[PDB]
Design a protein around this ligand. Structure first.
Ligand SMILES: CCCCCCCCCCCCCCCCC[C@@H](O)O[C@H](CO[C@H](O)CCCCCCCCCCCCCCC)COP(=O)(O)OCC[N+](C)(C)C
Ligand SMILES: CCCCCCCCCCCCCCCCC[C@@H](O)O[C@H](CO[C@H](O)CCCCCCCCCCCCCCC)COP(=O)(O)OCC[N+](C)(C)C
Ligand SMILES: CCCCCCCC/C=C\CCCCCCCC(=O)O[C@H](COC(=O)CCCCCCC/C=C/CCCCCCCC)COP(=O)(O)OCCN
Lengths: 424, 192, 96, 48, 96
């Protein structure tokens, strides 16, 4: 008749059944791990190169039928049921057997070619992290706004924009080599810090993207529309974001003087035991804690528009905070500073994970504890340790109960959670 | 208790399958999480507030200082109070900051102090009391300073006091600085 | 800087002692508020308790009406009721 | 305890799949399971 | 273990002593420090033990102390400061 009577309606009818050798082993394991980590790309390359060999061998005068001449080994499959070509198989037999460390380098180069889209962002971030300037800031932010927020590609023309921008930047710095520091990288010193490496990696990515086959205001309305569709990859990366946040917290705990008005490498335990309570430590902890609470709220509520707005606010706020007021108040801009750049790198890892989560979307299966996946002794011990720390279990439970969809009261939710923990 | 709960539920039945009254859910959850956050952050935030604008200045109202040789009698003893206690002005703070500029630790420590917190004690050079001493003990002092085959100390004690009416726990603080005179050194001969 | 006279009894506890004395106690209390709730389900989730309340009221009535034997039998019945959970379910079922 | 764990996992799944009535029925089943020890023994028996 | 070898010696570095009559003024006051603080030698410990031999409690108590724990304070007989006193108060002292 009502909700309460449904709660209190149970009966028995519901329960009715119906040395050198070790080094060789380690390098072999490393090569095996790399091969397993890029197996799909290896198969892609193998099928593509077999098809290319078929296409080039037939090139007597002209290849006239695009399907027909290739159809000697319906047009939409990803498998391998082809013939055998002796030179090919002898080539990979030669590559496989007679090699100790050449195969390791081959696997590494195959991996870096297989990705070709992560090391570009890594090099851009490193170049901006080693040369802080308003010239080198627009590229990382528009990577965090275009490149990681275009779903069914890395992007369409963002790459050409990157080439054109590094073009113009290196030309301008070369001309100026004949407050500018914050304005740009025009100083009478080493000017091409990482521009050459970034350009080479970018063009290598362009070459790979071309060879393996791809391209190279209402527009923004369409862009924001495509961020709201159905049935994307549907994979959640949240525990990694939490781990990155914990790493940032640890960095702040150990290194917090570098954000103060004058770094002195003072200890935190001494200051708290001496009753000093430094301001910067407090403000970083409050900001980080609020960020994690908001992130958990967004993840539990399972919304993408809110998460995208939070990301676009957070990335611009973090970028504005550095390169700016933060090195303005203390004259250790970026290169001289040691831990600020590491903290920034961790925060870029967090931003990348958040953008990946936004693009992929949220999988239906959530609310499971990120420890209750396999029942090992390590999992049991670490979960008990997790439940031992004060205020974490109650806070997590209340946050879950508030921000997921359910018809239960808080006491019933706690009953269910306790039952689940004991049964686990 | 169970019957009271059951009848209270009966008086206000809830439709089957209804998600929840959002207002009460958000109210209770927000209050609980706010209370948890407040309990977690109470000591840090509260003390950082005390160290901030809300803290009351504790300006010492009396400083005493004594110089004593061995254990004979205080050679020098003097006090000081508000006519001779000079609170730092902003200008003097500027010179103090400029003096220690090439040292970061000093700048941080000074930065942790508001202008109206650092005071200068102008101690009169001359003693504030006669050096009472028995002539036999003075002769023993002179003999120890000439032929004493052992060290003799020189304590320079200072002893503050503050006002407890404004707020505080302990009224008096103090600390001695101790030298050490090696025998047959120039200092002992010169004192003699 | 020193704490104002009103908040002095807070300043007495050192920040670390302010955590241990107050924060950890509150944490222990809130943890114990929901520590073992599953165990006390059998006696805390009865659908209808009118019969048990009537039994207790009859015990109280016979206690003063002087029919002491009836009190002994009712107490034995109540003890058995709380001794077997199946009879507890049977009595706590909701009638028409 | 595989059956009880499966029941809890179904509760968690239906909590997010929006079939709220199924959550209410599963919670009632779990409460009854923890209310009678005999059904607890029956469900905690080991199968083939 | 603390009472044993691991214990650290606590040797006083200053002893003061005053003799005062009524409440008028300290008649005698004197201090003493390391030039006049004589730590016991093993020999002096032997004489100290031999002096109290016919008493068991004294021997036990002394036995509870390591040679490098008992010190002698050589206080100068003469005062270390003039006997400041107001003549009216001196006359009152004599009358009392
Ligand atoms: C100790 C801890 C562990 C780490 C240790 C260090 C590990 C370091 C690993 C470094 C790996 C670097 C990998 C770099 C890969 C670059 C690939 C790039 O060069 O590709 C070229 C193409 O690059 C692009 O065209 C852009 C231009 C890049 C120009 C770079 C020139 C560099 C020349 C360096 C010569 C060095 C000579 C050294 C002699 C000793 C040619 O390939 P392409 O012909 O497309 O292949 C097409 C067919 N595929 C797709 C199946 C492969
Ligand atoms: C401070 C003084 C100097 C200021 C200088 C400012 C200069 C601004 C210049 C801006 C140039 C923007 C160029 C953008 C190029 C976009 C290229 C395009 O291809 O990208 C598209 C995506 O475009 C992006 O969505 C545009 C994002 C624009 C965001 C603008 C943000 C502006 C923020 C301003 C903040 C200012 C703060 C204060 C600063 C002082 C990809 O769409 P696609 O995937 O092919 O679409 C598929 C569907 N098709 C097939 C039909 C095409
Ligand atoms: C000074 C150094 C001290 C030692 C540092 C050691 C660091 C070790 C590094 C990381 C270990 C991580 C292991 C745990 C990973 C859990 C991943 C996860 O999922 O996290 C959530 C985390 O849940 C929360 O959101 C809880 C926290 C919410 C409040 C915000 C916390 C702010 C940061 C606090 C850090 C701890 C405080 C002290 C910091 C210094 C000491 C560590 C819990 O699991 P579920 O979400 O239920 O799983 C669902 C997945 N499908």
């Amino acid at each position: 008749l009502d909700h309460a009577t449904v709660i209190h309606s149970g009966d028995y009818f519901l329960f009715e059944s119906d040395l050198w050798v070790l080094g060789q082993a380690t390098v072999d394991g490393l090569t095996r791990w790399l091969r397993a980590f890029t197996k799909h790309h290896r198969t892609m390359s193998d099928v593509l190169c077999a098809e290319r060999y078929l296409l080039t061998q037939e090139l007597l005068r002209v290849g006239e039928v695009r399907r027909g001449v290739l159809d000697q080994l319906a047009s939409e499959l990803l498998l391998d049921r082809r013939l055998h070509i002796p030179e090919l198989e002898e080539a990979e037999r030669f590559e496989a057997q007679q090699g100790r460390t050449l195969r390791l380098l081959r696997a590494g180069y195959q991996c870096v070619a297989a990705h070709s889209e992560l090391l570009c962002y890594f090099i851009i971030i490193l170049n901006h992290m080693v040369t802080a300037s308003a010239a080198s800031l627009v590229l990382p932010v528009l990577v965090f706004l275009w490149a990681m927020l275009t779903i069914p590609r890395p992007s369409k023309r963002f790459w050409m924009t990157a080439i054109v921008f590094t073009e113009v930047m290196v030309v301008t710095k070369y001309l100026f080599q004949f407050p500018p520091r914050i304005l740009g990288l025009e100083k009478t010193d080493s000017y091409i810090k990482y521009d050459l490496v970034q350009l080479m990696a970018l063009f290598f990515h362009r070459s790979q993207l071309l060879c393996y086959g791809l391209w190279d205001q209402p527009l923004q309305r369409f862009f924001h529309d495509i961020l709201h569709t159905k049935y994307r990859a549907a994979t959640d990366v949240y525990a990694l974001m939490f781990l990155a946040d914990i790493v940032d917290i640890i960095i702040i705990i150990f290194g917090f003087w570098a954000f103060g008005k004058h770094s002195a490498a003072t200890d935190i335990a001494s200051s708290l035991s001496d009753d000093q309570v430094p301001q910067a430590f407090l403000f970083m902890l409050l900001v980080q804690f609020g960020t994690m609470v908001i992130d958990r709220a967004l993840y539990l509520r399972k919304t993408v528009l809110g998460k995208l707005a939070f990301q676009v606010v957070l990335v611009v706020a973090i970028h504005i905070w550095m390169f700016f007021i933060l090195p303005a108040v203390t004259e250790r801009m970026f290169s001289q500073n040691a831990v600020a750049q590491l903290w920034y790198f961790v925060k870029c890892i967090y931003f990348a994970l958040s953008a990946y989560q936004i693009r992929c979307g949220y999988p239906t299966r959530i609310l499971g504890n990120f420890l209750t996946k396999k029942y090992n002794h390590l999992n049991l011990f670490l979960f008990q340790g997790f439940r031992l720390v004060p205020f974490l279990v109650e806070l997590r439970a209340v946050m879950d109960w508030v921000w997921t969809d359910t018809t239960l009261s808080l006491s019933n939710w706690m009953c269910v959670e306790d039952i689940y923990a004991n049964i686990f | 208790i169970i019957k009271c709960s059951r009848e209270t539920e009966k008086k206000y039945p809830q439709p089957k399958g209804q998600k929840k009254k959002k207002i009460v859910k958000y109210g209770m959850g927000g209050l609980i999480i706010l209370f948890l956050i407040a309990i977690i952050w109470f000591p840090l935030l509260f003390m950082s507030l005390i160290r901030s604008v809300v803290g009351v200045v504790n300006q010492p109202i009396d400083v005493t200082v004594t110089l004593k040789l061995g254990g004979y009698e205080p050679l020098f003893t003097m006090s000081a109070q508000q006519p001779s206690i000079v609170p730092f002005t902003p200008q003097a703070y500027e010179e103090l900051s400029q003096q220690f500029d090439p040292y970061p630790l000093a700048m941080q420590f000074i930065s942790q102090y508001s202008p109206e917190d650092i005071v200068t004690a102008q101690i009169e050079g001359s003693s504030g009391a006669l050096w009472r001493i028995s002539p036999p003990s003075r002769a023993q002092m002179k003999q120890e300073l000439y032929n004493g085959t052992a060290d003799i100390t020189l304590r320079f004690t200072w002893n503050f006091q503050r006002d407890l009416a404004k707020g505080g726990t302990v009224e008096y603080t103090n600390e001695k600085h101790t030298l050490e005179l090696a025998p047959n050194s120039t200092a002992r001969r010169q004192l003699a | 800087k020193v704490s104002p006279p009103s908040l002095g009894f807070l300043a007495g506890y050192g920040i670390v002692g302010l955590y241990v004395e107050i924060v950890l106690v509150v944490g222990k209390f809130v943890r114990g508020f929901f520590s073992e709730i599953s165990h006390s389900i059998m006696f805390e989730e009865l659908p209808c308790v009118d019969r048990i309340l009537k039994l207790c009221q009859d015990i109280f009535l016979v206690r003063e009406t002087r029919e002491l034997e009836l009190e002994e039998e009712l107490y034995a019945k109540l003890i058995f009721l709380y001794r077997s959970p199946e009879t507890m379910i049977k009595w706590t079922r909701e009638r028409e």
